[PDB]
């Protein structure tokens, strides 16, 4: 999507593993505000819009 139309999509009732994001070997700036990335997969939160 574009920056004039980046939709607030509700993708619900799923899972999302981030260990395959951790070993993707292509990330430049991985910044997780509020909570640490090491405790991101085991504990989650609501309102998981992307």
């Amino acid at each position: 999507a574009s920056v004039y139309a980046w939709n607030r999509k509700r993708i619900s009732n799923c899972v999302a593993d981030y260990s395959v994001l951790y070993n993707s070997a292509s990330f430049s700036t991985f910044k997780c505000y509020g909570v640490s990335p090491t405790k991101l997969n085991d504990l989650c939160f609501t309102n998981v819009y992307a």
Partner: nanobody
Amino acid sequence: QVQLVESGGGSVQAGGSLRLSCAASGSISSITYLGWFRQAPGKEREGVAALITVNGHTYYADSVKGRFTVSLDNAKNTVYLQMNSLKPEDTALYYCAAAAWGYAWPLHQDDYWYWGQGTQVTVS
């Protein structure tokens, strides 16, 4: 909560070898990312080396690519920086930084880092 004490500096002729270390004390498991900084005289402090503690992936700058390597020792909680094939443009102040928010390449001064006391590396 993260305290870094670094050592391993000194003077050597160009073409020699040196080895820096940066000992980490405190919340070791919260540290996710080790970055090595370098500030030349008359220049802004830039980034040289990078290390992810979880993955082990290394990132290097273009001026230090093929000559500089970084390694982690989890038993001593101390990151290592080995310098091979030194040139006299590397005379600068070196710093070690520990991150607890994730990994970001390239290194930037304005982000939150736990900063070391700094050491002098002089080559000629």
